[PDB]
């Protein structure tokens, strides 16, 4: 049974921060890429397997940071200088399996 546990959401005041984390469970993680999106539904972060090749959506430049914990089963999202327009459901997602998500409210 595929498992992804999304957490670290909340409500914050802009300039402020949120730390999202997804916990992978049930299969081998490190040979696959891990992603975050926010909600149309717009992809936010994608971190390829192995940690080398990082790709950030254009909302996330120099602010959001997708990180990888392979030791195992943790994928990090570091949101600094949060904005209400970026307040949304953060979906941790890998391989046809998207997390249940987290709620982000910025104001």
């Amino acid at each position: 049974q595929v498992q992804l546990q999304e957490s670290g959401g909340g409500l914050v005041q802009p300039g402020g921060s949120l730390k999202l984390s997804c916990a992978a469970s049930g299969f081998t993680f490190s040979r696959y890429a891990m992603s975050w999106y926010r909600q149309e539904r717009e992809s936010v972060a994608r971190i390829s397997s192995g940690g080398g090749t990082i790709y950030y959506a254009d909302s996330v430049k120099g602010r959001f940071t997708i990180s990888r914990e392979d030791a195992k089963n943790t994928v990090y999202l570091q949101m600094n200088s949060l904005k209400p327009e970026d307040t949304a459901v953060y979906y941790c997602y890998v391989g046809g399996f998207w997390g249940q998500g987290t709620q982000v409210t910025v104001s």
């Binding site: 080398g52 090749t53 990082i54 790709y55 950030y56 254009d58």
Partner: protein, 74 residues
């Protein structure tokens, strides 16, 4: 060698941008799909000198540098 193509295709948005950049620096265009015009464009390498690769990746960096590095650290 086809996995980087659709990759760059969805990492762009506008396809006509780097085509207009490539202009006069070209009939692939009757192909209906937007990424079609991309995929055949990298079969044109024999007509692409060093300055052409330079053109593509300099336009890529003059757009988004991470994309240049992404094609680079391949």
């Amino acid at each position: 060698i086809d996995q980087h193509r659709a990759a760059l295709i969805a990492r762009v948005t506008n396809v006509e941008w780097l085509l207009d950049a490539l202009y006069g620096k070209q009939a692939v265009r009757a192909e209906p799909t937007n990424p079609s015009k991309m995929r055949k464009l990298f079969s044109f390498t024999p007509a692409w000198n060093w300055t052409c690769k330079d053109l593509l990746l300099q336009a890529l960096r003059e757009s988004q540098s991470y994309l240049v590095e992404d094609l680079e650290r391949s």
